[PDB]
Design a protein around this ligand. Structure first.
Ligand SMILES: [Mg+2]
Length: 771
DNA sequence: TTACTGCACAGGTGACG
């Protein structure tokens, strides 16, 4: 029950003052709403980079209002571009904001200034460096050597409300991999060309920073490439001219024949940098480096020690102007009651409840294991038990002709053992995977023409696809294409598997004087485990056969997930306790955003179909956005439900609340708990327990959907949820985010960081790179 | 083993040839 955060108090905040001047944007009378807020935040962004001051937007009433720091001198007031031209008329009354005050609507304004001024002393520390604005600060000295790549340790620092009052700082340790030797002066024109879009650390003497390689310069370092007042000047001359005092040898003694790289400034100017001083950042998610990836996963005591060490070392004294700020060395710590996992309903009227008489950890591990063993027990089994509708297994011809038949028999038998009530009996069909070219077009040509023939009787299809490209930081457009077309042109519900991993599970054997394929079990996959996982996720879940549901009601009657990526939106809906789950994909005119009319269309359609099966009149709705919510999306959701309350489809006083689920948090905070110190663990720091939670604010909370009993290595990463709108209390929203993350359907015996609502969003999108 | 779970990065935007 004893929890420590990575929130540190801020001292000397008194006498620190932040003066702004509200302007209002004449803009265009016509508000495309979605285009209106894009242009506002575009200008706020443009202004911040060009004048280097903490510009902010204050969206109240008219939602305009650009806040200009009072200390900037000449201010254009009128600004070009931005479609129609905009003008800013100051709203008078210049604001001098204090940090000892109660909660205002100007707290977003205070947080922007606080963030901005706090990283000035750090940016001036000769032993630290920052890749770019807003990023963590790293030590210049590498932490670890790692044999041709260097490992750098850094810490993020972000301003945040303090739950006991006032303001503070939330921090987390970060890791970065940079190759040890520079790109080099002797690297030729073609080799530099092969680095476009890669990112490098540039050691410009004592000023280190990161940039993206855009092009290769036509001019070497000692040849004139720019001019310093008419006269042509080499890059070598420019770096000598802007060095100070005791400049390092490396920036005044550059190889004249070396090449230079080119990058774009955040105001879109072009600059050059000598390849002799540039060190490639290892995108480790782009090129599989798993021995590296382990270096990034920290034990709780390592993670707590690195963060606190940075605090006591660089934020003890902090001068911003004539201000003396300190970050206290002791993080905020608290006592709380921890949420227990919810009671669950399985087959045959069987409930699973956490045992309240055992100690918490033993009780959590028993509960979690039992989610798997109850699902498998033919005396209890799946909550939803029924025969499947007809099914199809669509295999490449090359596979059907080799190990396909052996895989299918094993796979069929695995489904029937996992879901005995289903009678799984698929028709096995093939497509000509070698007749048209093996790329994405050509594979799709063969898949569509099997479809066009009508060989896919039955509406459900599981199709085995070939892998085109690896690199886990890419996009598999073939699976998205197949799902898109089969859904749109035929009426099919499609699930996908790939052919590389199951094929590794079979080896050819000579038996009774005939070649046969049998299971193997060396290295490449664990084929028995693969068959069970695919059986649950692709056939059972893909037919909406839910293994277990919540016994008791959530705080919300209905919660809806929303994610938009790649011009494809997903809407998920969970009602009853997961007895009613729905997923609609729909195309979107913007890459990552939704029109107001589209939110209200899809949601009134989705809910209306289901309302006659919701036998409780509905009076609390919650929307879970993956990431930031946009005002037209908030508006489209408030309209949907104000409408339904007037028809009588829903309680006449039902209310909606919108929460942003920030899985990559702008203020990532950690929680730790404690234990008897023990040789290996001299400070006794351990992960928090599964149900731990903390609110900072009426608008910001954290729940551990992952934690102590169920984690193998590393430290739990608490899920940040933020209230965008609505009456519901953040504590109530955190509780049923937690209950929804206990519906661990893809892997029953496990913890799962995302609630089922946006978990369904990640499954269904997989970044839909077509339509 | 990407059938699947965690942790990692992902987030946050002022610099700087
Ligand atoms: Mg993180």
């Amino acid at each position: 029950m004893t929890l420590e955060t990575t929130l540190f108090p801020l001292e000397g905040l008194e006498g620190l003052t932040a003066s702004y001047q509200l302007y209002a944007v004449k803009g265009l009378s016509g508000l495309d709403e979605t285009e209106y807020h894009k242009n506002v935040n575009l200008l706020v962004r443009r202004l911040s980079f060009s004048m280097k001051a903490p510009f902010v937007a204050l969206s109240r009433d008219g939602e305009q209002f650009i806040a200009v720091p009072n200390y900037v001198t000449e201010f254009p007031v009128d600004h070009r571009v931005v479609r129609a031209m905009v003008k800013l008329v100051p709203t008078g009354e210049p604001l001098n904001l204090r940090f000892d005050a109660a909660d205002d609507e100007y707290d977003g304004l205070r947080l922007r200034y606080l963030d901005f001024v706090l990283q000035q002393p750090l940016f001036a520390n000769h032993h630290l460096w920052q890749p770019g604005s807003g990023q963590p600060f790293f030590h210049k000295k590498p932490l670890k050597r790692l044999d041709d790549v260097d490992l750098y340790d850094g810490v993020s620092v972000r301003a945040a409300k303090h739950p006991e009052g006032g303001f503070g700082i939330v921090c987390d340790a970060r890791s970065k991999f940079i190759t040890h030797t520079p790109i080099g002066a002797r690297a030729d024109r073609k080799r530099l060309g092969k680095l476009i879009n890669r990112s490098c650390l540039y050691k410009m003497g004592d000023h280190w920073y990161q940039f993206r390689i855009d092009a290769v310069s036509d001019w070497k370092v000692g040849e004139p490439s720019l001019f310093e007042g008419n006269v042509p000047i080499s890059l070598a001359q420019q770096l000598v001219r802007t060095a100070g005092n005791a400049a390092p040898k490396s920036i005044i003694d550059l190889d004249p024949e070396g090449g230079a790289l080119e990058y774009f400034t955040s105001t879109n100017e072009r600059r050059m940098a000598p390849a002799e001083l540039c060190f490639l950042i290892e995108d480790t998610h782009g090129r599989r480096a798993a021995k590296l990836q382990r270096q990034t996963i920290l034990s709780p005591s390592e993670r707590r020690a690195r963060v606190n060490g940075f605090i006591r070392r660089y934020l003890s004294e902090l001068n911003i102007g004539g201000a003396k700020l300190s970050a206290g060395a002791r993080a905020h710590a608290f006592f709380t009651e921890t949420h227990m996992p919810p009671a669950l309903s399985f087959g045959n009227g069987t409930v699973l409840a956490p045992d309240t008489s055992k100690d918490r950890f033993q009780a959590m591990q028993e509960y979690s294991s039992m989610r798997r063993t109850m699902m498998l027990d033919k005396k209890v089994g799946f909550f939803h038990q029924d025969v499947f509708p007809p099914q199809t297994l669509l295999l490449p011809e090359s596979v059907k002709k080799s190990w396909g038949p052996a895989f299918a028999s094993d796979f069929v038998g695995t489904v029937q053992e996992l879901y005995p009530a289903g009678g799984y009996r698929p028709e096995i069909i093939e497509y000509r995977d070698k007749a048209y070219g093996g790329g994405v077009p050509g594979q799709m040509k063969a898949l569509l023409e099997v479809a066009e023939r009508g060989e896919i009787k039955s509406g459900d299809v599981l199709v085995m696809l070939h892998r085109i490209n690896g690199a886990p930081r890419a996009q598999d457009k073939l699976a998205a294409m197949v799902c898109n077309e089969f859904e749109k042109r035929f009426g099919k519900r499609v699930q996908v598997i790939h052919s590389d991993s199951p094929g590794r599970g079979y080896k050819r054997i000579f038996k009774n004087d005939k070649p046969t394929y049998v299971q193997q079990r060396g290295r490449g996959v664990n084929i028995k485990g693969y068959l069970k996982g695919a059986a649950l996720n692709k056939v059972c879940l893909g037919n909406s056969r839910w293994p277990f549901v919540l016994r008791d009601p959530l705080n919300a009657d209905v919660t809806i997930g929303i994610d938009v990526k790649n011009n494809m939106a997903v809407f998920t809906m969970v009602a009853e306790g997961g007895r009613i789950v729905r997923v609609q994909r729909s195309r979107s005119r913007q890459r990552e955003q939704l029109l107001e009319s589209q939110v209200t269309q899809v949601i009134t359609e989705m809910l209306s179909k289901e309302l006659p099966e919701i036998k409780k009149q509905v009076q609390r709705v919650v929307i879970h956005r993956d990431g930031r919510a946009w005002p037209a999306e908030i508006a489209g959701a408030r309209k949907t439900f104000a409408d339904m309350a007037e028809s009588g489809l829903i309680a006449v006083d039902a209310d909606v609340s919108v929460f942003e689920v920030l899985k990559s948090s702008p203020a990532p905070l950690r929680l730790f708990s404690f234990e008897e110190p023990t040789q290996e663990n001299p400070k006794g720091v351990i992960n928090p327990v599964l149900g731990s939670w903390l609110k900072l604010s009426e608008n910001d909370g954290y729940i551990c959907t992952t934690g102590a009993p169920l984690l193998l290595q590393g430290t739990a990463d608490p899920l940040h949820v933020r209230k965008a709108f609505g009456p519901m209390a953040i504590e109530d929203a955190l509780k049923d985010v937690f209950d929804l993350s206990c519906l661990t359907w893809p892997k029953p015996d496990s913890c799962m960081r995302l609630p089922l609502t946006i978990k369904l969003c990640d499954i269904a999108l997989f970044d839909d790179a077509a339509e």
